[PDB]
Design an enzyme around this catalytic site. Structure first.
Site, PDB file in Angstrom:
ATOM      1  N   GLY A   1     -59.015 -27.455 -61.173  1.00 24.07           N
ATOM      2  CA  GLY A   1     -58.925 -28.672 -60.401  1.00 24.07           C
ATOM      3  C   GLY A   1     -57.799 -28.628 -59.383  1.00 24.07           C
TER       4      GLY A   1
ATOM      5  N   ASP B   1     -63.497 -19.134 -81.150  1.00 22.41           N
ATOM      6  CA  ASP B   1     -62.886 -20.172 -81.961  1.00 22.41           C
ATOM      7  C   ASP B   1     -61.857 -20.947 -81.141  1.00 22.41           C
ATOM      8  OD1 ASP B   1     -64.375 -18.644 -83.640  1.00 22.41           O
ATOM      9  OD2 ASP B   1     -62.798 -18.300 -85.129  1.00 22.41           O
TER      10      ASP B   1
ATOM     11  N   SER C   1     -64.971 -21.464 -61.684  1.00 20.31           N
ATOM     12  CA  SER C   1     -65.404 -22.487 -60.742  1.00 20.31           C
ATOM     13  C   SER C   1     -64.192 -23.309 -60.339  1.00 20.31           C
ATOM     14  CB  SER C   1     -66.482 -23.382 -61.359  1.00 20.31           C
ATOM     15  OG  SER C   1     -66.830 -24.439 -60.485  1.00 20.31           O
TER      16      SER C   1
ATOM     17  N   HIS D   1     -68.697 -22.044 -79.131  1.00 19.37           N
ATOM     18  CA  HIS D   1     -68.000 -22.106 -80.410  1.00 19.37           C
ATOM     19  C   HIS D   1     -68.543 -21.112 -81.428  1.00 19.37           C
ATOM     20  CE1 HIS D   1     -65.720 -25.101 -83.247  1.00 19.37           C
ATOM     21  NE2 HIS D   1     -65.133 -23.922 -83.145  1.00 19.37           N
TER      22      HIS D   1
ATOM     23  N   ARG E   1     -47.204 -15.953 -53.282  1.00 25.06           N
ATOM     24  CA  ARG E   1     -48.266 -15.868 -52.287  1.00 25.06           C
ATOM     25  C   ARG E   1     -47.707 -15.941 -50.873  1.00 25.06           C
ATOM     26  NH1 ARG E   1     -51.634 -20.639 -49.769  1.00 25.06           N
ATOM     27  NH2 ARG E   1     -53.255 -19.432 -48.696  1.00 25.06           N
TER      28      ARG E   1
ATOM     29  N   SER F   1     -55.143 -15.784 -51.246  1.00 24.87           N
ATOM     30  CA  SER F   1     -55.263 -17.164 -51.687  1.00 24.87           C
ATOM     31  C   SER F   1     -54.857 -17.298 -53.151  1.00 24.87           C
ATOM     32  CB  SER F   1     -56.692 -17.671 -51.491  1.00 24.87           C
ATOM     33  OG  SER F   1     -57.631 -16.804 -52.100  1.00 24.87           O
TER      34      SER F   1
END
Lengths: 231, 231, 231, 187
Positions: free
Chosen positions: D131, D164, D106, D160, D1, D15
């Site tokens: 995170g 799987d 997200s 599910h 980057r 980014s």
């Protein structure tokens, strides 16, 4: 003189211009360039000149003609011709050398150059060049041939792309030989080599790119190992 | 054999020769040459081959095709075409690769080469080359395209100038990669670099000199910083 | 956008394309390439710019134009023209410079370039380039001339082969200047030199190979010894 | 980057989220189940990758959609994301510009979140949660015996009845390989 002066065109110049225009219109040219190390020919020629104690003088152009004839033997397509209805393949090699006579250009023909030694080739080239500068050449002595060679290394030209004669299929163009600086594995890491750049102008409807590349590879091998011409 | 033997011309050769002659007569070619440092692609290809543990094999020609497609995206004129009344600009990049099959030349087409990765391009090229050497290709699989690439570096060719196909507007010609001796600021003062020379043959009624030069600059940037192809 | 978009051709583009097509059909081009060491011009230009304390700015293209005019004076054939019935030789040198205006190409003409200094040439070129980018040029200010120069070294182009204008006979093509590594006899054994490659595209029915080679030799001598332009 | 930002002399800004979107699209190409959907009667498998990015506009949450993210470069993705985020903060978005998609991402690393587990949108089948990136102390074979590495933890929330455990694990493995060898995205 004034602003400009118009020079009438002679009939010889007119017919030459017409032939060249027709060749450029009809033949689709394509150019292939390679580079050749001449350090071995530079030694072989010196040794042969020492051996010939004034009997004859051998030039680099003679080795070039010999290598061209041998390469035409190995790859017959570069020595072929296009005749619309049929493609004519020549089994003999006639090399037309371009000499810049100070009246234009002349093309003395060396016949059967594939079965002649460098000394016979040199003598024939010298005699034909003297006759061309004199101005007395029979039509069969400069009209025809199967392969063409043009050299302009005496003028400092590095590369150039010539024009194919209408009947033929290829033409070799030789430029100046220069001392380059190639990489080496010695202490310094580099070495000086005498390199010469050659461009082959092929007719694409007769010679393919791979075919022309093979021809150039064989020519380069013959020139970079002169003893290979014994085979 | 005799003095010469005349070989009749097949219909395929006749039509190919007619097409090439018409292209050379109608398209005003002009040639632009640049040089590319391949030391970064030589490392990226090795790393990708290590990563692909036998899954696929990536060649330098695949990176060349990818860079050509990206450069055609950036400069649309080199991917355009001339149709007398109108100029057609193609928004997709179809790259016709020239393969020297030992029966002539073949042009397998890689479609949508601007949105494909090097692995898909490599697989497509390998499959099409195998089919071409077999001798079974559909007309749509080798007739058409928007850009053309021809490589002759396997034969030792340093430079060459190809011929544009009649509908297209440009053709790229790739020569051999050689270790040159470029200046450097290190202790020795020089460094060995692997250089490759490429010639673009543009149609001057569609592509201007500045446009072709920009295309070559973008192609060179893509090849000399391979991570730029991520953008 | 879709798959492709067809762009209509303007009348100016149509007539330019027709002229270029006719030139390529009628004029048999042949290309001659040489290399020039620019280390002395790089110093002369710097000294002259220091002397001219803002009075004017002198570029390398100005020295190139001056050397071209002087070489055309020495070898008149490169400044001549072909008119079918007669060959017109011009005693004055009008140099048409190719400027890549971001609307196509423009050819401002520097008249009597053989009897003008580099400062007058520079001022004329700057004024004509500004007027060309503006878009206001009289027909006589860009139509005509006896010699043509095209430069593409700003784009990184190393070599290229341009197209002759139909009335003229030659065109010079200038590529990028690059620092090469030439052999030397000093302690290291090599020296860095700024080299520039130029290709002359001659009309073979007017200019012979030896004539073009002499023209290139004189051009190279003028550029490599700038004080020779005083003679 | 950093190298690409140096190359783009102000032309664009790239980014880490753009590389994340690219790797997600490529991994969805390799493992099609994570890009599929459940429709009770039938299971729909999408051959194109539309990535819905979650932006925390200070009025709630918005989901600008990047279409055809599997055949776009990081620069086009970055420009699209920037434009859509500006339009979302403005408050003017067409319904088709934020309703739909095949995959969802997200990111909450700007807030110092180490891990989190998001909620799948009803039509889709998976959602990726990113995170914060932190400098850990991983073992090494050098003189010291350890090395500092920037680690980032990601949680995939799979459906599910469509995905799987082994399938989701393969998807995560491919995503990790793409992100840890960025040149692999050329293939």
């Amino acid at each position: 003189t004034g602003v400009f002066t118009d020079i009438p065109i002679s009939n010889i110049r007119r017919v030459i211009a017409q032939r060249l225009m027709q060749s450029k219109q009809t033949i689709p040219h394509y150019y292939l360039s390679i580079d050749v190390n001449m350090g071995e020919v530079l030694l072989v020629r010196k040794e042969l000149n020492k051996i010939l104690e004034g009997r004859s003088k051998i030039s680099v152009n003679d080795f070039i003609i010999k290598a061209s004839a041998l390469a035409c033997l190995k790859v017959p397509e570069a020595n072929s011709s296009w005749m619309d209805t049929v493609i004519r393949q020549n089994h003999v090699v006639d090399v037309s050398v371009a000499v810049s006579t100070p009246a234009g250009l002349i093309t003395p023909i060396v016949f059967n150059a594939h079965i002649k030694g460098v000394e016979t080739i040199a003598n024939d080239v010298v005699s034909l060049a003297t006759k061309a500068r004199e101005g007395k050449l029979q039509p069969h002595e400069f009209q025809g041939g199967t392969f063409t060679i043009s050299n302009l290394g005496m003028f400092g030209i590095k590369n150039f792309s010539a024009i194919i004669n209408p009947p033929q299929a290829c033409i070799l163009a030789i430029g100046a030989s220069e001392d380059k600086l190639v990489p080496a594995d010695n202490e310094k890491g580099f070495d000086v080599a005498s390199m010469m750049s050659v461009t082959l102008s092929c007719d694409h409807r007769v010679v393919d790119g791979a075919v022309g590349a093979q021809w150039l590879a064989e020519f380069r091998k013959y020139l970079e190992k002169p003893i290979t011409m014994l085979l």
